[PDB]
Amino acid sequence: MLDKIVIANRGEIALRILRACKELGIKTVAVHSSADRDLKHVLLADETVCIGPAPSVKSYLNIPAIISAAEITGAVAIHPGYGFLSENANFAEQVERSGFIFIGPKAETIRLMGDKVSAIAAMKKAGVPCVPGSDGPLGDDMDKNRAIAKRIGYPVIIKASGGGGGRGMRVVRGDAELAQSISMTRAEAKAAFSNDMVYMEKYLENPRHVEIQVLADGQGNAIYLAERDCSMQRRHQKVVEEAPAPGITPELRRYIGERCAKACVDIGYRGAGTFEFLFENGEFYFIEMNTRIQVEHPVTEMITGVDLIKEQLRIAAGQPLSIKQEEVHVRGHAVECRINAEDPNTFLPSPGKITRFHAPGGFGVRWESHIYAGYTVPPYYDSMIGKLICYGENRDVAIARMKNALQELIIDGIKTNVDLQIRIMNDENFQHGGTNIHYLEKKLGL
Numbered sequence: 001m002l003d004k005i006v007i008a009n010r011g012e013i014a015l016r017i018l019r020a021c022k023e024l025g026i027k028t029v030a031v032h033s034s035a036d037r038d039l040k041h042v043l044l045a046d047e048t049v050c051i052g053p054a055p056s057v058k059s060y061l062n063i064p065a066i067i068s069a070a071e072i073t074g075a076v077a078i079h080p081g082y083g084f085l086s087e088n089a090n091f092a093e094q095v096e097r098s099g100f101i102f103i104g105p106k107a108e109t110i111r112l113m114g115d116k117v118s119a120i121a122a123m124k125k126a127g128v129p130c131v132p133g134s135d136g137p138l139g140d141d142m143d144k145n146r147a148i149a150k151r152i153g154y155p156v157i158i159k160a161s162g163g164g165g166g167r168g169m170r171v172v173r174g175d176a177e178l179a180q181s182i183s184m185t186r187a188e189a190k191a192a193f194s195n196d197m198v199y200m201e202k203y204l205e206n207p208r209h210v211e212i213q214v215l216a217d218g219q220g221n222a223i224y225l226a227e228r229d230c231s232m233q234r235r236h237q238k239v240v241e242e243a244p245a246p247g248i249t250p251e252l253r254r255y256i257g258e259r260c261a262k263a264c265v266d267i268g269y270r271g272a273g274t275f276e277f278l279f280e281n282g283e284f285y286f287i288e289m290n291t292r293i294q295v296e297h298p299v300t301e302m303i304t305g306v307d308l309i310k311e312q313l314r315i316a317a318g319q320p321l322s323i324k325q326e327e328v329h330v331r332g333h334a335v336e337c338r339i340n341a342e343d344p345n346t347f348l349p350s351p352g353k354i355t356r357f358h359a360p361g362g363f364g365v366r367w368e369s370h371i372y373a374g375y376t377v378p379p380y381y382d383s384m385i386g387k388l389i390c391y392g393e394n395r396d397v398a399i400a401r402m403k404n405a406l407q408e409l410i411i412d413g414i415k416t417n418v419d420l421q422i423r424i425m426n427d428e429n430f431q432h433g434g435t436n437i438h439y440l441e442k443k444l445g446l
């Protein structure tokens, strides 16, 4: 087992990782910005290093500073969390180059999946169903581009290969807009990722966002841990996630999960990973792969019993997966509500000092947050300050537990989305289940 690790992150995920370390007897090094001295996990860590001032470029994205902290503390490994440098292949390469373990896949694997064109070709080759598309980069030849669009069928979508999070992608519904759409997406891709490579996909009008959790170790073991529905979103920001996905039969779960695990074996994947799919008309279509642990990982943990962060640390230490596939069983239902320090009318971050705090409790209630009474939410980072996860023996009990828990949650002094989450829980269509990726924006529009 790993002696000591640096937690190269902040807020809730850093505390999540810290708890996992402590359970395993792993010494913790909290690296933090000058704005993050009073973070709960920093306060609980065995060692702390201030790695720079508030802005992330000089703290949590500061590669030399994070590596130096691992060096000076005698840490053997670095957990990147999610966000920041977790999908940075150059960072992971530098970590291993410097002699430390990067808690994730190989840098080659990160780089493969961070290139959307190459990642798709690898999945399609491995037997994972993908969106009908160009199966290759789009050139500058617009006669070819119109032919590819005719072949696929309008509507189509133009996407940056080096991009993510819906940044720079446009729907095209006819030839007349195609040239201009390609050109703009390409220009925005060059400006944002220094990679002007773009591709084309059939545009799916009303899909659900359903993703498969995987774990792969260094002994050839690769398993799937069911799915998450993350369709309840706004402007490419998830709001509610749940596991398993409503409507998904064990037969579908088996079908797509086995194909994801098979893909892991083919690519020599290691650690925790997520295969993202658009799900429409009973069909799965691969869009992209995340090589990190994700925000919404706790709902998967509730329904399988598997502690995914502890699995990450074991894999990195050279231990095999602590469970086998036939030992993985979907039990019950879990719902996650993201808690954001945000303005209700603008949806912009709403930082400030929390004056009164109370966390909910009870059976099946899980609160994932660093916040406390007296804590100041800094303006420099993401608005998400906490995660409320509620489990029940079925979906309805999970929703009922969520409502009660949201009504016990007190966070005064700052603006939050607790009232919105309450609205979503009481939403008749959510309560029915199976609402598509566009539902929340349509509901908010009304």
Ligand SMILES: Nc1ncc2cc(-c3ccccc3)c(N3CC=CC3)nc2n1
Residues within 6 Å of the ligand: 131, 157, 164, 165, 166, 201, 202, 203, 204, 205, 207, 209, 233, 236, 278, 287, 437
């Ligand atoms: N070919 C498609 N069709 C629909 C899509 C909806 C997408 C979508 C829109 C809004 C919310 C979730 C997914 C989406 N992504 C945005 C982030 C990367 C995947 N990609 C699509 N590709």
Ligand SMILES: [Cl-]
Residues within 6 Å of the ligand: 082, 083, 293, 294, 295, 296
């Ligand atoms: Cl994430």
